[PDB]
Amino acid sequence: MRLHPRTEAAKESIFPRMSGLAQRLGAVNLGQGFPSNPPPPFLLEAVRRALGRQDQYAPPAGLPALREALAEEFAVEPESVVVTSGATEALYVLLQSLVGPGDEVVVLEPFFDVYLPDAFLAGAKARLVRLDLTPEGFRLDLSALEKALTPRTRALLLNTPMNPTGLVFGERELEAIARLARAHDLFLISDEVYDELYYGERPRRLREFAPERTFTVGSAGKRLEATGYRVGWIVGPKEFMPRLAGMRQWTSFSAPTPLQAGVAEALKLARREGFYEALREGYRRRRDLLAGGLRAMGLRVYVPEGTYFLMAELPGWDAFRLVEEARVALIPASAFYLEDPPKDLFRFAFCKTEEELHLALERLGRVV
Amino acid sequence: MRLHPRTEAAKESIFPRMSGLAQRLGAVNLGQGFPSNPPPPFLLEAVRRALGRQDQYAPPAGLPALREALAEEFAVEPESVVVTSGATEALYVLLQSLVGPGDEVVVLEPFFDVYLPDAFLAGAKARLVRLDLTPEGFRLDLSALEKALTPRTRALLLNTPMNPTGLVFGERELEAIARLARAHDLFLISDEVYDELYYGERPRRLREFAPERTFTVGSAGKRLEATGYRVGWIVGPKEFMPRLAGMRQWTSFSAPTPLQAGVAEALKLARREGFYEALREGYRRRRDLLAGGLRAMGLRVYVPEGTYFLMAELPGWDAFRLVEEARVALIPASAFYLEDPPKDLFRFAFCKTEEELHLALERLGRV
Ligand SMILES: *Cc1c(COP(=O)(O)O)cnc(C)c1O
Numbered sequence: 001m002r003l004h005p006r007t008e009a010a011k012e013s014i015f016p017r018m019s020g021l022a023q024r025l026g027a028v029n030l031g032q033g034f035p036s037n038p039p040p041p042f043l044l045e046a047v048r049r050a051l052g053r054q055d056q057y058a059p060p061a062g063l064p065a066l067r068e069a070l071a072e073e074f075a076v077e078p079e080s081v082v083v084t085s086g087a088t089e090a091l092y093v094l095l096q097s098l099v100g101p102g103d104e105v106v107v108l109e110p111f112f113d114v115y116l117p118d119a120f121l122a123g124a125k126a127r128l129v130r131l132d133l134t135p136e137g138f139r140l141d142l143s144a145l146e147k148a149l150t151p152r153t154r155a156l157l158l159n160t161p162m163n164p165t166g167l168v169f170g171e172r173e174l175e176a177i178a179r180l181a182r183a184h185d186l187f188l189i190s191d192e193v194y195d196e197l198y199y200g201e202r203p204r205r206l207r208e209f210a211p212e213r214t215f216t217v218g219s220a221g222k223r224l225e226a227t228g229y230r231v232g233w234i235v236g237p238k239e240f241m242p243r244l245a246g247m248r249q250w251t252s253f254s255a256p257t258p259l260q261a262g263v264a265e266a267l268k269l270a271r272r273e274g275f276y277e278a279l280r281e282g283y284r285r286r287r288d289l290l291a292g293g294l295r296a297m298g299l300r301v302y303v304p305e306g307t308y309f310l311m312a313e314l315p316g317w318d319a320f321r322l323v324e325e326a327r328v329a330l331i332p333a334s335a336f337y338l339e340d341p342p343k344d345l346f347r348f349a350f351c352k353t354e355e356e357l358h359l360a361l362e363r364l365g366r367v368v
Numbered sequence: 369m370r371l372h373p374r375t376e377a378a379k380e381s382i383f384p385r386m387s388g389l390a391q392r393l394g395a396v397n398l399g400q401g402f403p404s405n406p407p408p409p410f411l412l413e414a415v416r417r418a419l420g421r422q423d424q425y426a427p428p429a430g431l432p433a434l435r436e437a438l439a440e441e442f443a444v445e446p447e448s449v450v451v452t453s454g455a456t457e458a459l460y461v462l463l464q465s466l467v468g469p470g471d472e473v474v475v476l477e478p479f480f481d482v483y484l485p486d487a488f489l490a491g492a493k494a495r496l497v498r499l500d501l502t503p504e505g506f507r508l509d510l511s512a513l514e515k516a517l518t519p520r521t522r523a524l525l526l527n528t529p530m531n532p533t534g535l536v537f538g539e540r541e542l543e544a545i546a547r548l549a550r551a552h553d554l555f556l557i558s559d560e561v562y563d564e565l566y567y568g569e570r571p572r573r574l575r576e577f578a579p580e581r582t583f584t585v586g587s588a589g590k591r592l593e594a595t596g597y598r599v600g601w602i603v604g605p606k607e608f609m610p611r612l613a614g615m616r617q618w619t620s621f622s623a624p625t626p627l628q629a630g631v632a633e634a635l636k637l638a639r640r641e642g643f644y645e646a647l648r649e650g651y652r653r654r655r656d657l658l659a660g661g662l663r664a665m666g667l668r669v670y671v672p673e674g675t676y677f678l679m680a681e682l683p684g685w686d687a688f689r690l691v692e693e694a695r696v697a698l699i700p701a702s703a704f705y706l707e708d709p710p711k712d713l714f715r716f717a718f719c720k721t722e723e724e725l726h727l728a729l730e731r732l733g734r735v
């Protein structure tokens with residue numbers, strides 16, 4: 001008796017693997033992304049208030065309260081919102097409902113750890129499109145993007161703000177995509193879990209330009225510093241939504257109720273108390289600190305416009321040697337690139353305390 | 369642009385759709401099974417202690433504490449335990465790991481609405497194996513079981529205490545089933561979310577007869593009256609575990625940290641405080657009460673051995689036409705069987721207050 005060949009895709013993600021390596025080595029974890037602080041008090045109290053009164057099942061699509069709250073933020077009706085057990089389940093169930101054997105899916109590179117595996121588990125094939133790493137940071141070359149479409153291609157998967165690059169797609173760029181989308185009738189899947197986490201002008205969502213074909217993915221845990229709550233969501237044309245609620249219902253049924261209840265209150269409060277504004281500033285401060293401290297170490301640093309990840313190049317090192325000898329953990333570029341990853345490109349996470357970032361800066365320092 | 373054909377199965381499940389109808393109609397919801405009371409105090413307290421301390425990502429396989437708590441209850445080691453976002457995810461991930469294009473999966477009948485869709489979504493066939501229905505009650509047939517076994521069969525999928533029959537499989541039958549599996553070199557998927565909800569005698573576990581190929585599935589929701597916590601588990605041979613964690617990794621990454629944290633303490637407190645003991649007590653009453661009350665009316669009632677459900681026969685009736693006039697929710701057998709499902713067989717659910725049980729009978733009587 002042997003497992004089905006499909007299970008060849010079930011390999012320990014690099015993120016949780018390095019997190020274990022770090023505790024074991026007493027290293028500073030700047031790898032897997034998750035805040036070192038607890039989530040805001042209003043979320044915790046909202047969850048506390050839900051325990052003992054909203055502990056049982058919830059409609060597969062989500063608690064009405066949560067849907068209504070997402071509806072307002074997005075300016076859509078409740079029917080167009082489906083609450084999943086994390087953005088992770090949103091992405092899996094999405095690809096699952098949009099591609100299959102013989103179908104192609106464009107995926108920008110470097111990509112996010114869950115895409116390819118999700119694609120493969122659906123049957124589709126990865127149409128990687130490597131962004132250029134010019135001395136001014138990454139950038140999408142629409143020509144190279146365009147040269148990658150075919151009669152098979154049934155969908156395009158975007159990530160903005162982008163993990164791990166930190167790139168924020170600009171208006172003109174989104175047009176070009178919503179455009180190409182329509183031209184070949186391609187589906188649009190936008191991973192925007194970091195929608196509220198940007199450091200410049202407020203980005204323009206992608207559903208604006210190509211509403212009829214856009215699926216926008218978000219995460220409560222990436223919004224409210226509570227990555228362990230597993231409450232995510234899909235927002236797209238209401239006609240398809242009912243099926244998606246059908247899919248995710250076989251995968252896990254519905255998200256945790258008391259957590260769905262708490263996030264519901266928390267999303268509205270957050271919009272009223274200016275929580276996202278403060279969070280962004282707290283992140284910009286730590287972004288500049290890390291990037292600035294690395295700069296002083298004559299390293300090449302590519303300042304991000306969004307998310308709490310940043311990319312730098314450390315000459316002549318590799319994750320596993322760095323974690324053991326410098327006591328600092330990082331995610332190696334080869335985790336995002338399917339082939340030939342820019343040697344010496346590492347990803348730093350700065351959703352940590354100022355003291356952890358400094359500790360990393362000092363340890364990396366005396367290891368010239 | 370159209371959604372991939374696979375979505376054929378992505379059809380709203382009956383249970384949440386009937387609860388919406390029941391609710392909306394002001395009808396007693398003895399359909400979808402979920403307790404009317406809140407989870408025990410020691411589970412809420414423990415979750416509360418976790419909020420603020422354990423809110424970030426846990427490992428895909430699960431929180432060390434939880435895996436260890438389960439490891440002790442099942443007499444195995446942590447590595448053979450993988451925590452899932454509810455049992456529902458156990459099943460999905462499971463069937464998706466043992467069968468694909470070309471494989472077949474034996475399934476008993478009546479079934480749990482998740483079974484075929486999963487098999488279906490796995491790209492494999494799921495030949496059924498209906499059970500009998502003598503006056504005594506349901507009945508298994510190792511013969512039919514023995515027959516459905518073809519060369520393409522990769523695994524069987526048991527479920528005891530069985531939902532929706534309340535049937536608690538006996539030792540000789542498990543063992544009998546164990547034999548088949550080892551002979552044909554099959555996998556055994558045991559859905560045991562109701563392992564602690566039995567009205568009879570401490571039921572034996574399949575894994576005691578074929579521990580080398582049996583995957584046991586459980587659920588904190590069913591054990592602890594907290595169905596919305598979405599914390600479940602798969603306990604199987606350690607050699608296959610690293611893979612199962614890798615599959616669920618891609619589905620929902622890992623279960624809710626605070627809930628996993630709280631369930632971990634609760635599983636231990638439960639044994640100690642004799643919680644399960646008493647949970648079985650109160651479920652007995654409500655079991656007897658709801659069935660006797662149906663005899664007084666004069667119907668065919670099958671007193672279950674386990675679970676908090678129970679099936680009965682309602683003369684020339686159906687589903688929606690009931691939740692409209694009688695204003696009481698029930699589940700028609702059409703959801704458990706694929707074709708030609710028994711006449712007038714409706715599954716209730718007595719995990720409600722005594723009040724709700726009574727008030728459900730009244731509205732039943734005047735019809
Ligand atoms: C964190 C992350 C996810 C997953 O979010 P969850 O809600 O934790 O499952 C998906 N996509 C990207 C790009 C992420 O950074």
Ligand SMILES: *Cc1c(COP(=O)(O)O)cnc(C)c1O
Pocket residue numbers: 252253453454455456457480527531559561586587588589590595598599600
């Ligand atoms: C409740 C139930 C499930 C699902 O359990 P979750 O932990 O809520 O996902 C699966 N199988 C049976 C027989 C059940 O009764």
Ligand SMILES: CSCCC(=O)C(=O)O
Pocket residue numbers: 015016031032033034163425621
């Ligand atoms: C869900 S694993 C971690 C995902 C993430 O935020 C990361 O890119 O580190």
Ligand SMILES: CSCCC(=O)C(=O)O
Pocket residue numbers: 253381383399400401402531
């Ligand atoms: C499929 S959600 C409901 C699960 C359950 O307990 C039931 O069968 O009623």
